[PDB]
Design a protein around this ligand. Sequence first.
Ligand SMILES: CO[C@H]1O[C@H](CO)[C@@H](O)[C@H](O)[C@@H]1O
Ligand SMILES: [Ca+2]
Length: 128
Amino acid sequence: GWKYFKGNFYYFSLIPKTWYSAEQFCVSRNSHLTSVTSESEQEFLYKTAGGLIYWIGLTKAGMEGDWSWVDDTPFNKVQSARFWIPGEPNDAGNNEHCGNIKAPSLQAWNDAPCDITFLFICKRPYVP
Ligand SMILES: CO[C@H]1O[C@H](CO)[C@@H](O)[C@H](O)[C@@H]1O
Ligand SMILES: [Ca+2]
């Protein structure tokens, strides 16, 4: 039940997991929690999400707490500013170190506590 979009397959989970347990599940399926690197990808993801919240590959790295992609796609702070929900990341309780797709819009991302369970999206490259 993987959905194909532009050289990648995506898995929209039916079971909710914590950010890391979801990531482990993806890694066990030769994938990672999805990065988002274009407007068309963001749009594909939030429309497929159908108004439900899904963990994606957003998580903090380094001492400064910069956001990063768990699949090691370099995080482009400038080019991703448009993808956050207005007001996010707000870091609530000083404990929101992972990211999900929340709002059904281009401005979709929210930071949430990593140990909260949500549905999740894996991303797997297609290699011909
Ligand atoms: C109540 O907290 C929730 O809503 C705020 C926005 O008000 C988000 O930033 C936060 O991560 C939670 O999802
Ligand atoms: Ca938040």
